[PDB]
Every structure is written in structure tokens, then in C-alpha cells.
């Protein structure tokens, strides 16, 4: 009865890869996933291409009311899901990155299975493998202890009400929730669930999709 | 007599069969086909059973059966025998590389040697931390750590043999940290996303997929 709403705040989401753009590959994962009950994508007011995404995914909702920053648009999205009746305060919101278009099904599964029924919420993440270094101006100014450190991935699953309190007044959704006194879980993410930031990342993604 | 570039691979699972050759064979292949790399050594443990057949595919490469009990130790042993045997002069570059990073781009290694090769301090291949970092506590997030100006170290780690030799004798997870404790600040050279270390089963998928 409690729903699982995918929320995707949405510049490489339009890249052509395979046959569809990055976003199309992202929506596909959520809309084809059993556990996910609904998927919403917040785009900017005058987002010229979003319109065409809507015609491939009618069940998905493309609201043209984004903010100037990721943080803001997630806020807007959650406040229109709550304020419309689509999401009850206790419904789960899975915020996902527009560019992580290689999210395994069993990873998403896993998030919902361990974070879905945990008040605190949960985030997909992988343990820091590599030694960490603090750069200064091209040079190593120090080594930071990676002891018990994890790299956060999306999606980040939290109750809509909790999430709405959280963002109401600082990099991810989880950081907002940790500021309340709530410790979200850390769920094994995935190596292939990488964000397409650099051109170098496109290669591995294209290779992953196809 | 020009300054060399000696790849050093501490290898005391690098034996995973992927493609047609094992992980190690794919690593050695990168260094042995690379122009700028003058020599490639691999330190395996005393009684390593499968190192011998690696030698037969790479005669120029040298497999010394004298590893330590720990990565740090064996790198130390290898650098000490490269110096103590005359193969490497104090000013010669030693590129330590992870036995399991079998997807090192050629231009990446090229780049390391081009920017760290003639820089006393040394250098390491690394990529900036993209993702928010979180401090776990026992399955939960106990704190978010600022990723501002942080990089993820990769291999190889290129340093003069002598410097390296001083560094390791001191007494701390990678080579760079050892040189950093000398007052030396090794550079940060753009590494590669594909230059990933095969540690979990989930990585093999991506690696196999990369060696195609």
C-alpha cells in the first residue's frame, strides 16, 4: 500500500547512446521495475526536449517546474508529490541522478528491500576501495583515512514527509536527512551504477548498455 | 645512458582467467608493449606455483620469487633488488602497479611518464572524487565527509628508485603516502575510469567487458 516513487531531477542527460538518450535509459529502468509504483521527472520550465520524453513514457510524469539548483528542484518535486495527493507523508521517494543510466535491477531491488521498510531511509553506496588524497594545486597535500568510508550513489530512498522536512532548511539527499538526527542505511550500490560526468565515462556506459 | 622507467608489479586474484590470458598477463602486456617502459619486473612469493609459466610468455619480464608477507614489504624487496643489482640507478623511475589493475589505458600510462617522469617528487594516476562521501558506523551513515579537493589514488605510482627506497624504510597504505611522509608532495596525474582494480565479482563483469 505504501508506494515507491522514483524522483529524477533533470548536462549530459540528452546524450545519444544505444538508440535512446541517457534519460530514456534511466526512465526505462524504473518503469520496467516491478517494485516501483510511479516515476516523475522534474525538468526546467522551458525544457525543449522533455516534451518528447513524455511521448515514449506516458505513465511517467514530466513536470516543467524545476529550480535553479539540484537541491531546489528535488524540493519542488517532493512538495508537488505531497501537495497533490500522489504521495502520502509515509510514502518512499527514490531520488535518482539523471545521468546514472546503468542502475542494475537487483541493486534497485535491494534498495527497496532493505530501505523500503526502514524509517531512516537508505542510500546505494560502495565502500571506498582506493587510497584517498587531498590535492592542493596539482600536488598531494595529504592522505585522508578511508577507514569505513563509502561513496554515495543514487537512488536515495526516504519517506516523502521526512524528505520534505529535511530539505526545508548539503550535497545529497542523505546529508539533509543526517542533519535531522536520522542515520539513513548504507546499501551495497554497484560498480556499474556510475554517473556519466566525463567523456571517459561515456565509453564505459555505452559499453555497459550495449 | 638515459633514465629508465621500470614497471614494478607486487604480486605475492591476479590469476583469474578472462579473455584468454590471466589478469596478470593482461597487465604485463600493457607495460611490455609500451614504448616508454624500459623494463618490467613482477615480485611473486617464494613458492608461487603459477608465476613460472608467466615467465615463459614474457621472457624480457623478470619474475623474482622473493616477495614479503605484505604488499608494502614486497615492493620494498623489489626496489631493493633493482637498486642492489644495478638494474636501477637511484635516479631511475620505478612505476609500482597493482597486479589487479589490468585495464590501464596506454595514454594514461603515457601521461604519467610524461608529467611525473621528469618531476623529482614523483606522481600518481588519480581521479577526482565525484561522489558524496559518507562515514559508515555499523550499516548506517554516521557522518558525511567533505569531498572538496579529494582524489582517488590509482596505480601506477611513479617515483625515483632511491627516493622510494628511503621512503619505504621509514615506517602508509600506498607508495605515495610513504613519500609524503618525507616532505615530498608527489603530483596528481589524471588517471582513468577504466583503470579500475578487480577486487569484487562485480568488477570482473566490467573488466571482461573492457578487454573486448
From Swiss-Prot, chain A:
A GO BP annotation: isopentenyl diphosphate biosynthetic process, methylerythritol 4-phosphate pathway
Top-level lineage group: Bacteria
A Pfam family per the record: IspD
Entry annotated with the keyword Acyltransferase: no
Leading EC class: transferase
Molecular function in Gene Ontology: 2-C-methyl-D-erythritol 4-phosphate cytidylyltransferase activity
Pathway where it operates: Isoprenoid biosynthesis; isopentenyl diphosphate biosynthesis via DXP pathway; isopentenyl diphosphate from 1-deoxy-D-xylulose 5-phosphate: step 2/6
UniProt-listed Enzyme Commission number(s): 2.7.7.60
Residues of the site described as Positions MEP for the nucleophilic attack: 146, 195
Site (described: Transition state stabilizer): 12
Catalytic activity: 2-C-methyl-D-erythritol 4-phosphate + CTP + H(+) = 4-CDP-2-C-methyl-D-erythritol + diphosphate
Annotated Gene3D superfamilies: Spore Coat Polysaccharide Biosynthesis Protein SpsA, Chain A (3.90.550.10)
PANTHER family referenced in this protein's UniProt entry, alphabetically: 2-C-METHYL-D-ERYTHRITOL 4-PHOSPHATE CYTIDYLYLTRANSFERASE, CHLOROPLASTIC (PTHR32125:SF4)
Sequence similarity: Belongs to the IspD/TarI cytidylyltransferase family. IspD subfamily.
Function in brief: Catalyzes the formation of 4-diphosphocytidyl-2-C-methyl-D-erythritol from CTP and 2-C-methyl-D-erythritol 4-phosphate (MEP).
Protein name: 2-C-methyl-D-erythritol 4-phosphate cytidylyltransferase
Organism: Neisseria gonorrhoeae (strain ATCC 700825 / FA 1090)
